[PDB]
Amino acid sequence: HMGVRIENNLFYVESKNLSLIIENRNGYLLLKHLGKTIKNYKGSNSVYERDHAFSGNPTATNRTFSLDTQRQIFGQHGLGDFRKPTIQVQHSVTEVTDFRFVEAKILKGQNGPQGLPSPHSMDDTETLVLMLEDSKAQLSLTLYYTTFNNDATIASYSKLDNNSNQEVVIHKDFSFMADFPAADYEIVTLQGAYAREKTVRRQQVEQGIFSISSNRGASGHAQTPALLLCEQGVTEDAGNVFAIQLMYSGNFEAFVQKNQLNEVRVAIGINPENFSWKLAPEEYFETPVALVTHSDQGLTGISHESQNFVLKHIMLSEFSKKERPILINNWEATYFDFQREKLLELADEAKKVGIELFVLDDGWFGNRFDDNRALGDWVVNEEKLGGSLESLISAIHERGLQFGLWLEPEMISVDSDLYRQHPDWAIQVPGYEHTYSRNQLVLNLANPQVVEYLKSVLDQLLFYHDIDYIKWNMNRNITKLGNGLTYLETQMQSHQYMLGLYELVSYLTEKHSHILFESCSGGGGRNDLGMMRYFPQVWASDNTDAIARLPIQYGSSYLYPTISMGAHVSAVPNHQMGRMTPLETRGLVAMMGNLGYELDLTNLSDEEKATIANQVNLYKELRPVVQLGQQYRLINPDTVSNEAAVQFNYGNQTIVTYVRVLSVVETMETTLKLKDLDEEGLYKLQENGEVYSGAELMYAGLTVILSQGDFLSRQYIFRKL
Amino acid sequence: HMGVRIENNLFYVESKNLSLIIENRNGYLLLKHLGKTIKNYKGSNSVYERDHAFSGNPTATNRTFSLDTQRQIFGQHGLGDFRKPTIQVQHSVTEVTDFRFVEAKILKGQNGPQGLPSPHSMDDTETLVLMLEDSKAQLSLTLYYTTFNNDATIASYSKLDNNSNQEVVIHKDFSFMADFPAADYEIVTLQGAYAREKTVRRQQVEQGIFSISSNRGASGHAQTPALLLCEQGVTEDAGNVFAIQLMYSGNFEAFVQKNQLNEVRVAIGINPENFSWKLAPEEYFETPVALVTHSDQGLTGISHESQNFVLKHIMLSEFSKKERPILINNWEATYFDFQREKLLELADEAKKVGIELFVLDDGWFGNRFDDNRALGDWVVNEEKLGGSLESLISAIHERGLQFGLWLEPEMISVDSDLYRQHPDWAIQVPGYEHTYSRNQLVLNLANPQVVEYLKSVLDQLLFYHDIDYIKWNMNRNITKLGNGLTYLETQMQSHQYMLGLYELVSYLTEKHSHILFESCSGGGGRNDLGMMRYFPQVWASDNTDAIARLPIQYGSSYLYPTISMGAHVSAVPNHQMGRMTPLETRGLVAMMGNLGYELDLTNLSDEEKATIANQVNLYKELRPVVQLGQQYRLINPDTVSNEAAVQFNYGNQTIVTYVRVLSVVETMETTLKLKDLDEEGLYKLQENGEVYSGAELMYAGLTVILSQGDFLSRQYIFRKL
Amino acid sequence: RNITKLGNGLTYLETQMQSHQYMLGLYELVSYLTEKHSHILFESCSGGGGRNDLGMMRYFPQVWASDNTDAIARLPIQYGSSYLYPTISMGAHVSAVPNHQMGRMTPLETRGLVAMMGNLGYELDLTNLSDEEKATIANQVNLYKELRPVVQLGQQYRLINPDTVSNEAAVQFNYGNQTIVTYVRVLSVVETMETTLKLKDLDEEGLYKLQENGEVYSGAELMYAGLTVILSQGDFLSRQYIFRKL
Amino acid sequence: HMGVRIENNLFYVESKNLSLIIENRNGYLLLKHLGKTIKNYKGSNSVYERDHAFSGNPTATNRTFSLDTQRQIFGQHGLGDFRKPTIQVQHSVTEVTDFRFVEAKILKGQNGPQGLPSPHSMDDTETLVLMLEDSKAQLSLTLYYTTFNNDATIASYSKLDNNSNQEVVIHKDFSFMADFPAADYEIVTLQGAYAREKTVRRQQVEQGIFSISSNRGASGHAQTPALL
Numbered sequence A, B: 001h002m003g004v005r006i007e008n009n010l011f012y013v014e015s016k017n018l019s020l021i022i023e024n025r026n027g028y029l030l031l032k033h034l035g036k037t038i039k040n041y042k043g044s045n046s047v048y049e050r051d052h053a054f055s056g057n058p059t060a061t062n063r064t065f066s067l068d069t070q071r072q073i074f075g076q077h078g079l080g081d082f083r084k085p086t087i088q089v090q091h092s093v094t095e096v097t098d099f100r101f102v103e104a105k106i107l108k109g110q111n112g113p114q115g116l117p118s119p120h121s122m123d124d125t126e127t128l129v130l131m132l133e134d135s136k137a138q139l140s141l142t143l144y145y146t147t148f149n150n151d152a153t154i155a156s157y158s159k160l161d162n163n164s165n166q167e168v169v170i171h172k173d174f175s176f177m178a179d180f181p182a183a184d185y186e187i188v189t190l191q192g193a194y195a196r197e198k199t200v201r202r203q204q205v206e207q208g209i210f211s212i213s214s215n216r217g218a219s220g221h222a223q224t225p226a227l228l229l230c231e232q233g234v235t236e237d238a239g240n241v242f243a244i245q246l247m248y249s250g251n252f253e254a255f256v257q258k259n260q261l262n263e264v265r266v267a268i269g270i271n272p273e274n275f276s277w278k279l280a281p282e283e284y285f286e287t288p289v290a291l292v293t294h295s296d297q298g299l300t301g302i303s304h305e306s307q308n309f310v311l312k313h314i315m316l317s318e319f320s321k322k323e324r325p326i327l328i329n330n331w332e333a334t335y336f337d338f339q340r341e342k343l344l345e346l347a348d349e350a351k352k353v354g355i356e357l358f359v360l361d362d363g364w365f366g367n368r369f370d371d372n373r374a375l376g377d378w379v380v381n382e383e384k385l386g387g388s389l390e391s392l393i394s395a396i397h398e399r400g401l402q403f404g405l406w407l408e409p410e411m412i413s414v415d416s417d418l419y420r421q422h423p424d425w426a427i428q429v430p431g432y433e434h435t436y437s438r439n440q441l442v443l444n445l446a447n448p449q450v451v452e453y454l455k456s457v458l459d460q461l462l463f464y465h466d467i468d469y470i471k472w473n474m475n476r477n478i479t480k481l482g483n484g485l486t487y488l489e490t491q492m493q494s495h496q497y498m499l500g501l502y503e504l505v506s507y508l509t510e511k512h513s514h515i516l517f518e519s520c521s522g523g524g525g526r527n528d529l530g531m532m533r534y535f536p537q538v539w540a541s542d543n544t545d546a547i548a549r550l551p552i553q554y555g556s557s558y559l560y561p562t563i564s565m566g567a568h569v570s571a572v573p574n575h576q577m578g579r580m581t582p583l584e585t586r587g588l589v590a591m592m593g594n595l596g597y598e599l600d601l602t603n604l605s606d607e608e609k610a611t612i613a614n615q616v617n618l619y620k621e622l623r624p625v626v627q628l629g630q631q632y633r634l635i636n637p638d639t640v641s642n643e644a645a646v647q648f649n650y651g652n653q654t655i656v657t658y659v660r661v662l663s664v665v666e667t668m669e670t671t672l673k674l675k676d677l678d679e680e681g682l683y684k685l686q687e688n689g690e691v692y693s694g695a696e697l698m699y700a701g702l703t704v705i706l707s708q709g710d711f712l713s714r715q716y717i718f719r720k721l
Numbered sequence C: 001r002n003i004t005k006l007g008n009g010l011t012y013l014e015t016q017m018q019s020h021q022y023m024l025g026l027y028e029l030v031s032y033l034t035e036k037h038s039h040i041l042f043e044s045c046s047g048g049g050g051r052n053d054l055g056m057m058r059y060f061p062q063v064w065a066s067d068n069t070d071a072i073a074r075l076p077i078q079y080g081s082s083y084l085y086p087t088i089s090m091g092a093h094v095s096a097v098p099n100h101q102m103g104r105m106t107p108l109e110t111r112g113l114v115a116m117m118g119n120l121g122y123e124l125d126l127t128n129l130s131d132e133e134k135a136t137i138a139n140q141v142n143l144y145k146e147l148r149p150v151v152q153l154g155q156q157y158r159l160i161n162p163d164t165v166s167n168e169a170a171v172q173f174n175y176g177n178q179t180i181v182t183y184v185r186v187l188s189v190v191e192t193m194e195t196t197l198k199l200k201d202l203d204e205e206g207l208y209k210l211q212e213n214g215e216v217y218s219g220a221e222l223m224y225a226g227l228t229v230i231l232s233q234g235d236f237l238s239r240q241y242i243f244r245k246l
Numbered sequence D: 001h002m003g004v005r006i007e008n009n010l011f012y013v014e015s016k017n018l019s020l021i022i023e024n025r026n027g028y029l030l031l032k033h034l035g036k037t038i039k040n041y042k043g044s045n046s047v048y049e050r051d052h053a054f055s056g057n058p059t060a061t062n063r064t065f066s067l068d069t070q071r072q073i074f075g076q077h078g079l080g081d082f083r084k085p086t087i088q089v090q091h092s093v094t095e096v097t098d099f100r101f102v103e104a105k106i107l108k109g110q111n112g113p114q115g116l117p118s119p120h121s122m123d124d125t126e127t128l129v130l131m132l133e134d135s136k137a138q139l140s141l142t143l144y145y146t147t148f149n150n151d152a153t154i155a156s157y158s159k160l161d162n163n164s165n166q167e168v169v170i171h172k173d174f175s176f177m178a179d180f181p182a183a184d185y186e187i188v189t190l191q192g193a194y195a196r197e198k199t200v201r202r203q204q205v206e207q208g209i210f211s212i213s214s215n216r217g218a219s220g221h222a223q224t225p226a227l228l
């Protein structure tokens, strides 16, 4: 049984197979247990209260109670706890608060912060409401913890109210914290770089502080808002994992602190860097939603828990179980150099090979002949498009293709009519030159006039044109913060920018819910759960190399479902890596994600066209298995591995893709075992007609055979009889 | 369904959850699968046949079939396979054989080599009999594989027949081999040293050859006949483990060879060192029994599989589930300096504290006043014992105590009547001085006159005296091999010694089956599964230090059940380590094994006596849980750990012992989680009366609290309600 | 091939002797011929590196290090083959693409530079090459004539080792006033800072003129600061830095 | 200064920057030091002689001297040392030998086994000749250690003579052995495969035995006769 329970001084937050048990101890909240379900909790794992030197006390005479040594669910500075704080508020001459628990309530159903992406489908949830007060400062802090009945996840966020007669300023306000008992731990994170997104990093927890953070005003290519605290020795198949994640696309921090006693704190939230928040009397602040997810089935277990929760409670219901169209995108195919004739030629060829959707990328608006101008001028270039956009769209519809369009709303070029009319709309500092990035500037979405203008322009574009799909890019990070009327307002503008973004995108996604929106940021520059609340797929990476893609897809689907993960077959030599790969391998790698194409189909041989049509035919069959099915990593592509293998199960269908990076000689063939089959099941392998029991495939596995050569791949397809 | 099946060219050997599937390929036997059960095996994991350079072929025209590259179940040298061989026979001018499969049979029930310890309780087994022949050499090799219906174990051994007209000579004949597919593996072994027995070693499998072996004529203190080939990343709780073990107490070898292609061979058997075996026409040779055991539940899983199989099919039925008596042994207590008065005083005190059995150790026979003489003179020293042995025994019986006696049958002192009468009975080389060890020599048990004499002397001792328990020591290794009439007979004498031992001990254990026999070899010098077929417990180590014992008991119960593992509370400062430990800790450590006492109870304070009586009271209660119950390692004592914790479950009883080696300060208390409880079960902790659900104990665990100081311990006792 | 089916003795003991006697017979044979024809350069071989040991190298002053003539597969092979044995012994030939063992295309520049870390030869059908490939080979031959003493007679310093985890290989040779460094990268990388490659065993105060840019660097700079190693996009690229001490 | 020196019961084999110092202890040869040059060696790193359980003795009354525990330069089986042996000879009904040191000589210049490849340019070398005998078996074992003045290398090999009236059979005869003191070590070897020759392998030394070997009648693609 699940939901929230209040029993004497214990609070139980109970999701499926995951409990958070909190004790009220004279106004202080103690984390008693976070993990597998325990009813009638007694306190076997209670902290032993002793005098720890230099760990101080709320009263003079009791040296054994210290907030330096108690496990907690939020952190303050200045009351004796010296671990990193997660709430810190300036008021009067101090930034000491002392929030004490005063009252708990339980809500049922939908619940979340205003103006920030939060879980949906909440009919079967309950929320613990822990109301804390600092009576001297006259502030309220309210903590929310939400159960899910169908997932091992709890969601959290807080609300800070200013009930005093003066302005106060928030300096730190994380969305989730947990004090875990001394033990050996490892952490997994997703880091990497542009064209290397979501690189899986694993390391030992060491004394001191480890963090990942973004100060770029987007979550960034190089860090994802995720941190997995794992049992020492965790594998794909076994061990305890706790994943903490943030539904936020701005500046964030995740940290792990191992303190002097070997205790471990973890927390995630809005980055303290580039953040302060002014509250006038009666005003309040709500933090983004954090998630804590648990598995005892290792890294595959946490992948599955995380993917499920995202699919059911974050990704838009309209798309979360909807097969996504196989597209063509002209970007790598033509860059900015195209016109109506080329587009329709490309469309004709896409149609021949059975592609479903045609995406017109950058270069259709203003005078956007290169990447040095025109951002901000969302006006159709009718000369380039050889007529109205309406006219191009009908042309595309008549050819049997859905129609998609690229936007980059959050940006403005110096050389643009927009910048000529409103230079003050750029993020900038009075009396400092611009910092440039891809020769463009960032619109100040903290300015409500900017948001209203973008709502208006885009509403107009989407209502007046039959567009089936939007690709929403964002191609630089935020510099030169100085648009406030005061320092505090500038310190607010990065979070306000985010609120403006979320207002903009929630409005458009809602008022045009039939359109499939794909998020983008030079590929994977902002691929987080904040964006995925509104954009059910994401351009995972500008790196379209089949081999470079292996670690990228490993990371990109680690916590997020495969359905979200854009992947396109592109030309050779590849434009990022300078590499020749087999067209078969580019096909098979892209088919481990959400398939599209991004090369000039008009310039391909008859043979290459035929191959692509065969791939499109294959994926139409494989699409439900890949997009709707359960993913199992069999061999991980990392720094030391020469291989990648991923399996998908979906009812009676089981597919396995295998790739080898470098050619090898006088090396015994890999044995590749499948996962999660019926031992007694009978599995017929498509290529040889042979029937194998699930036991054989799982316990003996496949001898994987390849010719000589680099970047070869193969796929095994199984039907359960 | 389990047993043996022959289906076309496949042989299935099916134990509970473990299958060996063998293919006959034109007379060559191929290992197709060893692992979890597979029915209707098709060959997903078949070796891919290609031309491997320098891997040669039985025929001229087929370069793709090579015994260098096929996975096999026995190894020959000279047919193109260059991996280490496990059968090698000299005949005529060569030691090339080419054994080819000719015929298979299936046996039911009891089956094993003559004169060597083998499994019992075999009603529900079936044996695959694979009959091979070298027609040119006129030799037969017969392989046996036995299923068990109640254990994930298969047993093997072979028989070599000389069907030719000339003498032939066996050079290598292992008991089990397996070729495993290229993959990442680790190996676990039990090594260590005298007073450091069975140290658990874990390492990576690397190209080349790793081995453990004994050339000491006993298995030895420093290596156990065991080798666990593990899945990379195996833990206590998860991963595949294959344990290969040998039922043999002589010279053995276990090896792992990773060859040029990354393939891995493992094998166990009689050491080739110090071994050759002459076969006259019509003569045959049978190897000792090897075992292969499997788990997919990690190292605890393989501990359990191995312990179960030993308990049910190796250890004598008479004792395998019988609570063992709590004993006193006078060895550390008095050494050689004792007499009737001292013995009965010790007995009185043992009785007061509730000890059940009194063991008279070394020094009662011949003129054994020190360790420099008298071995071989098994004559009661009636002066020292103050009358007949019969008289001492009645005295001990009348005091309520069972009676036990120390023997060392396999040894002879230079200064002894035996040596004076028969100097040629010693293992020795004509014209070389003796090599001495503890100033004693080894009897040549390959001489049938030696065996007949020891049968006679000991039968006489056991029939004429009411002895309840024997402790059978063996205190040196074998040097100076030279008693043969030819070189070949000397090369035979180490295995013949073993056959003589097994003849001797099987005879006595059988003809006196009411007596509990404890094996010994300066503690753990010969603690293997050969000895444990006859001796249901073993003096695990001369190291009776409570702390030094931690890693020793870890190793000693790794594959063998706790019931076998002798452990005695001894005096402080400890005689081996020079260390003071709490009497509580010596008690609790010894109670993780088969409890006895070995200190001068007459010299203890009133307080220490009281404590011992309380420990004896406690263990009477804990004995079934420890000796009959299921063992779970919670914290392993190794080189880097400051801790040890072991749990035992037995029906409604759950106990956990925790020891800390070094005192620590400003270090958070350990959280200790229990295993294998009912989540919903209610567990009442004896010390505080508190009731905890199994979920809490398993998922939250116990905060472990201790004072300041070294070598402290505690025990938590739980009753399931 | 390797030796199977031991059974030529008149007794078991003589068969047990025949493998060592085989060796004694080999050594008698090869010492005789190498001695009676000492002007001839003998190269030992055994499907490449099947018998590359110090017994053979007493008589055969070079050895075909490997049948694998792939430029990239050669990296770990040359690492091992010159680990204890001098570079002069280590046969290495520029071969055709796609490579016959690995099935791989590599730049002719890389096949040249990898083979020039050993004892250079060629092993491809020169009659079937383009005019351009011929020209390149003539340039490589010209280069190696210059580099030969440095490589064969000079002192070798491993700077980056090609192993299972490394994406790189770099080897330096010093010979009097000459210092060369070869660098190879196996897989193309993106958004990865350039490697810093430091040289070894120079004079701190020495002045080293880099051939490609004419710049003069003190030995201290080359050893303690090192070279930013720059490459285009692509797999199996290589470069060589050549230094003259002034 | 380099070459060979005999000073009381110590033998010094001195190459450039590498010394092998051997002690004759009542016929038994002990490895005292192998490493950087030491003159006037005293024995700071001598084995401490104690009773090790199950390590046996040449005489009845001295439990502290054992060939199981002494560091040596050649290994026999059956005299109490249980480490892998490097000389093992069958004669009569046994393969127990007990070779004892009887005499040392020093050679200068060219020197090597007949019919096997050996060092050249040996003008500036000296060879320690350690003559051992098993008087019961009537066998001689002679160990040679050669200095080089221009290299930190010592070369070794042995000669076994049958001085008895019967056929004898050599079962093991390695060319070099060394007992090194307990410490943490790693080993490097060159292994690999055809088309992957001489793959550098590095690993930790662990309790038990590690080996590389060829049984192919050639040294082989997959292992080189080297161990670091």
Ligand SMILES: OC[C@H]1O[C@H](OC[C@H]2O[C@H](O)[C@H](O)[C@@H](O)[C@@H]2O)[C@H](O)[C@@H](O)[C@H]1O
Pocket: A331, A361, A362, A371, A406, A473, A475, A520, A521, A522, A523, A539, A542
């Ligand atoms: O401009 C359209 C383009 O926008 C995003 O990529 C931006 C990157 O494109 C090129 O790779 C360029 O070389 C890079 O420097 C630049 O960051 C988007 O992710 C692309 O899909 C495409 O739409």
Ligand SMILES: OC[C@H]1O[C@H](OC[C@H]2O[C@H](O)[C@H](O)[C@@H](O)[C@@H]2O)[C@H](O)[C@@H](O)[C@H]1O
Pocket: B331, B361, B362, B371, B406, B473, B475, B520, B521, B522, B523, B539, B542, D053, D054
């Ligand atoms: O002699 C009886 C004794 O025998 C075995 O132990 C032999 C060891 O005893 C002492 O520890 C001695 O110091 C050691 O050198 C010697 O090896 C047996 O294991 C002991 O229980 C005891 O019976």
Ligand SMILES: OC[C@H]1O[C@H](OC[C@H]2O[C@H](O)[C@H](O)[C@@H](O)[C@@H]2O)[C@H](O)[C@@H](O)[C@H]1O
Pocket: B053, B054, C045, C046, C047, C048, C064, C067
């Ligand atoms: O036959 C001449 C050839 O001999 C040696 O190589 C033998 C190998 O040649 C091919 O690679 C063949 O495919 C292999 O199977 C065979 O082992 C020598 O090393 C070569 O240089 C060449 O002379």
